[PDB]
Every structure is written in structure tokens, then in C-alpha cells.
Symmetry: C2
Amino acid sequence: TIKWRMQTYAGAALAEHVAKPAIDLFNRIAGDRMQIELYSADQLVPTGELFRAMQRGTIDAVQSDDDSMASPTEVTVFGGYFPFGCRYSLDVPVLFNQYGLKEIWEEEYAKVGVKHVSAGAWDPCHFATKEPIRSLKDLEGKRVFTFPTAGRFLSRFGVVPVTLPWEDIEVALQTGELDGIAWSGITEDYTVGWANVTNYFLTNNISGAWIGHFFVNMERWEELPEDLRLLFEVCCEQSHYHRQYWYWGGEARLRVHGDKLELTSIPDAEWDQVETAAQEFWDEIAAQSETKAKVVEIFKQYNADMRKAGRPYRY
Amino acid sequence: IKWRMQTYAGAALAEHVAKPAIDLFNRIAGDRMQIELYSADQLVPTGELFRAMQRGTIDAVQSDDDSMASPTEVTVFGGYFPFGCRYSLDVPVLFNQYGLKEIWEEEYAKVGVKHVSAGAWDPCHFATKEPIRSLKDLEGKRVFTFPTAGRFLSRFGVVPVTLPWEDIEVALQTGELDGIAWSGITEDYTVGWANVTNYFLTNNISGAWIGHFFVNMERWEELPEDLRLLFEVCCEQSHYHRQYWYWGGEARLRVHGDKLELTSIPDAEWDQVETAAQEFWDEIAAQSETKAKVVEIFKQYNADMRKAGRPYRY
Ligand SMILES: [Cl-]
Ligand SMILES: [Cl-]
Ligand SMILES: [Cl-]
Ligand SMILES: [Cl-]
């Protein structure tokens, strides 16, 4: 009866793990009442058009971060990898459900005809590169695929952010068009084959957890009967849950036992310059609007409270 | 289809740890199937709960293995296996990636029960009327806890006491319970135990309780595919909700809660408890091959966390 098309930010090999299992489950349960067809990175429309395509109803739903999509909202810069925002993946659903971020995202997207269904965590952000990164100077001049706001941050350190479609990254790494990636953690690197075409993995992250969401065109959302609305919401939470343990398990296991990437580390005392720079970056963002200031203050109070709480949040 | 589920949780706790997902299931399933949810000891007492499900009097159960004393080789790892998990996410990873799901499934299938899914709940902390500032202060304390964690704690002079969950609040404000070692701070505030205790010891004896959804195997096999899948997804939703409910609650209440004063035993002193837990695991391992295999999985997992480093270990 009801037919949706969903496009995800994830390339095909990544979609197999971060969206497909929950959509397949939705489809097995819904049966003839409703089916969701899942399309991967840049398949139905280009990234630059993803948000507008959903808004106007060409595509019914989207799984994506705000930042790569360049959504016309005040919270776009907090999606993807907001530098040093969340130490832990569970910080994301806690910030959204308990510290007010859900209501802010709902309002921002509704103003533009889109239903924010649910936010979730993905992986930490690490450099994986052809050449080893052992110091901050080693970052200078490197052409790396990353997210827009993270890239803007990293530019302070001489990184050159380069944007290409996801399906092209593997060959771009192979030819040296890219010097590396700062788009993902180690789980994705091994799963999607990027570990096969890069050599080194830097242990110092610039975010403990990517922020992405499920979104639906508001008119399509309002057309849903209640039981299918609830079924979609639950399947999306199942998708988020699966990612919580897929990444928690994958990052540790592959760091310790993987053999396709050699680990490097920048000394803490040196990396502290990157953390310092990040809090100036947050201030620059807060300067830009009231909503941005509000969200930055929430990130600050949350992180300050983690320090006061102690173990196992902070040591 | 008509099912009755009984949870280990008291009524005030069940509102957070089972009811939302069962209500969602019921709204989605409609006339196809309904699950009536009962709380702690409501249809049958805890000590009869496993056999009641096995026999089919009750169709489904939300519980740890330990408090209902399931007759299996893995029962001692449910609830609060001392120092087994530092983090809540360790539970679904151990189950889904390090083989514990298949072991639980085989063990329960043997005794007529479907293990549907495991999940994490909260860390285990002492909440008490008098302050704990040293190990000697543990001696003599009558506390509500789980059977296996209680057997461990007994070596330190702790008196594990087993009462029905709904009786605990009054036992604390009046009459020989000196405290609880059954929960973390989120439950303590939510269910009212923080109103009748004064102190919260920051040194946990486990970072994450292990519980599960179980179904009578005959009832499980009778389910239509679509309803089985719906039940499984709603259970995962319940686990997800608890992952963030506890992650958010423990920190917030430690920092902003006004009802319990935080105390700490020095790390050097608390090392004695960690040492004793090591010995406890070895005792368990020696009891059977299945126990030995599970203990080895916990040891290897914790070893690999130290090798992995941040943010798993610092
Ligand atoms: Cl998924
Ligand atoms: Cl959300
Ligand atoms: Cl629930
Ligand atoms: Cl499981």
C-alpha cells in the first residue's frame, strides 16, 4: 500500500551494516502494508541535493548526518564530527533524550518541512593514511576526506579537506588523489575495504562519536497510520542499538587484532594543542547564532559534568 | 494470542525497564496478540518464576538468571558477576560477538526455554544508612543483593539478605536492612530507595547487570514469524532505552542529586576486593567446563580492553 524510498549517506558496503538490517526487518514485519526501498550514497540524487529532494518529496526518507547534507538549519554544524563533543557513543542518545537536543532538532527541521525521527551515534573519527602520522606537523598539507565542519577545524593544522563521493574514495586512496581519510573509525575501515588501500591508523581521535539521524518528509510522516509510525520508530531505534554494540566491539577488537593498519600515536602533551584549539572553535560557532550558542553551552555543561561524575565517564 | 510476562522489576521500576516496550508491542500488534505485564512476585514468587515459565503458566519473563536460580551452568554469570563488565555496552558485545548468545541459547533450550536476548542494566553500588569509608565498614551490613554477588560479598562480612523487591523501601527506613547492593543511583532515586538511605559508595562491584528476555519454548515456536520479529525488535528497543537511561542517570544524579552523600574507599584498599574477585572467578571456573569456558571469555575480553586502550581503559 505505502511505498517509500530512503537514501542513506552510507556507501553500499557500509549500508549493509548501518541501515539495511533494520530496514529489512521493518519490511518483513510490515509486509503488504508498507515497504521501504533503501538506496545508498548518491544513488537517487547527489549529496548536494539530498535535503531538498526529501523536502520536496522526491525521496521519502533519509539517513544522514546534518553536516554533509548541508541542511538549512542552525544545528547543521553539530552533526557528523563536532570536534571533541562526545567522548562516548552513549553520550549521543543521552544528549538528545535528556539534555534537550531532540526538541531543538525537531523544531529546526520542522521549520523546513522535515520530521526529525531519531538521532544516534556511529563511530569515532580517526585518521587513516598512506604515510604515518606521529606529530602534528605530519598533518600539514595532507589531503584527507572528512566532514565539512570537522574539516574546517582541521584546516587550522594545515589539513586540506577534500570532498569526493563515498563510492570513489577507495580508488582515490589507491591512486594517491587522497593522502588519507578522517571520515570514520577502524570498524568501517576494515569493513568497507579502505584498510586495504591505506597503511596507518592514528589512535588520537577528534570525536568519540559521529551524530546522524533518520529523517522523513513531513507530509509523508503525517500520512502514516499510527501502528506503522511506531513500527518505523522502533526499527530505527533497533538500528541505533545495533550500531552502539557493532562499534563498541569493532573498534577495540580491530585495534588489538587487525593486521591491515599499523597504529601510530601523537604524544598527549602535543595533542593537547588540538583540544585547546577545539574549545576556541566551539566559541566561534557559538558566536554565530542564539541556537548555536545554546547547543554549544549544552555540550560544555555536559562535558564539565562528566568530569565531576568520575568513573567510568572520566578518569 | 494472549501472553503474560512477569518481570523481576518492582512496579515503580517496571515503568522504566519493561513497560514502554511492551506497550509499544501491544499498540503495533493490536488484535493479533497482546502481552499483559506483571511486576515483581505478582503472579508467582521469584523462587517459582523459572518453573512457572518452563511449565507454561507464564509465557515470558524479563529477569537475570541469578535471582530466579535458573537450573543452568550459566546462572552464576547473570545479575552482577563481580567485576565482569566495566561498561554497559560490554554486555551486548560479549553476547553478540564473543559467543555468549549461543551458549545461553543452548543452556536454556535444554530446559525448555528460549533465550530471546540479553542486555545490560545498571552498575552495582552500596546505598546505605551509615557511611562506608573503609572495608571494615562493610562488616555486619545486612543488604539486599543478588545470590552470586552476595556469596562473593559474604567473604567481607556482608550479610546478603533476600526479600521481595516491594518490601525493601520500608525495610530500609524501619528494621534491619542497613542498605542495598542491588542497583545503581538511577534506580535508587527513581524507586524511592534514596529517600530511606543516606550514603552512596562510589566503588562498584560490577559496571553492568546482565538480564534477559526469556520465553517458554513451546510458546516461542507457536509464534507467527512477523510477531516473533516484532517481539525481538521491541525487546532490543527496551535494551537500547536502558543503555541511555542508565548512562545518563548515573552521572547526572551523582553530580546533582541531593539525597545521598557520596563516599569512597581508597583505591589501594579496594584492591583487596578486586583480588578476591579474581579468586572467586577461578572457583567458579573449576566447577564445570561450561563455567570455565565463560570465565575465560570474560578474562580474555577484559585483557583485550587494556590492550585497546582509550576510551575502554585509561
Ligand atoms: Cl540497521
Ligand atoms: Cl533523538
Ligand atoms: Cl522498556
Ligand atoms: Cl543476546
